[PDB]
Amino acid sequence: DASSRAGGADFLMRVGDKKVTLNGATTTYRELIGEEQWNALMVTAQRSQFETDAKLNEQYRLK
Amino acid sequence: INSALNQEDPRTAWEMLQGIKAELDKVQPDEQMTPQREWLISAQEQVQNQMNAWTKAQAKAL
Amino acid sequence: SPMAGQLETFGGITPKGKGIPAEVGLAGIGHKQKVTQELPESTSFDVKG
């Protein structure tokens, strides 16, 4: 859900460094997700602002 | 869109494209990018290029 | 005007957007003139003997 919203890239980038304990192992949220999966999530979060908002895409492309 | 791109004056083409965008807003009433808004963004970029080529000729004649 | 806000929200890419006037979309695109009004000057053959 956060990958599909404006400002979600900042949220995900901050939360990737926080800790979580699951199945008896304490990891970070970036380690719980894969490294390539985290990179794909980051790309999606960064690029989704220009797909769900035509105003931003038009503004940047015209500039 | 193609007829708006075949005008001699770029300033008229820009306003024609604005009118076409207003027409499209009534059938796509949301904010996401569709393949039809890409048409209009590309058309506006082409009109900017046409404005460059037009200012060439105006400056040369002056 | 009472319709100054309805005209600016006409022609936007989305119904919540604003239309772009040609003075802003095409602003900055232009070419300078290479000819100036700096004229060549002539000199008189003045010999005062």
SS (H, E, C) chain B: CCCHHHCCCHHHHHHHHHHHHHHHCCCCCCCCCCHHHHHHHHHHHHHHHHHHHHHHHHHHHC
Straight-line distance from the first to the last Cα atom of chain A, in angstroms, rounded to the nearest whole number: 30
Residue of A nearest to B32 (CA): A52
Cα distance between residue A31 and residue A33, in whole Å: 5
Report the number of secondary-structure helices (H) and strands (E) in chain C.
2, 0
Alpha-carbon gap: C45 to the closest alpha carbon of chain A (Å): 58
b/e map of B4-42 (b: 16 or more CB within 10 Å)? bbeeeebbebbbbbbebbeebbeeeeebebeeebeebbe
CB B54 within 8 A of CB B14: no
Evaluate whether B27 touches C34 at the Cβ level (below 8 Å): no
Which residues make beta-bridge pairs with A25? Answer: A22
User: Which DSSP letter does residue C5 get?
Assistant: H
Q: Number of A:C CB contacts under 8 A? A: 13
Q: Give the contacts of A50 (CB within 8 A, at least 6 positions apart).
A: A56, A57, A60, B33
At residue B16's C-alpha, the angle toward residues B31 and C22, to 5°, is 85
Among partner residues B33, B44, B48, which is closest to A54 by beta-carbon distance?
B33
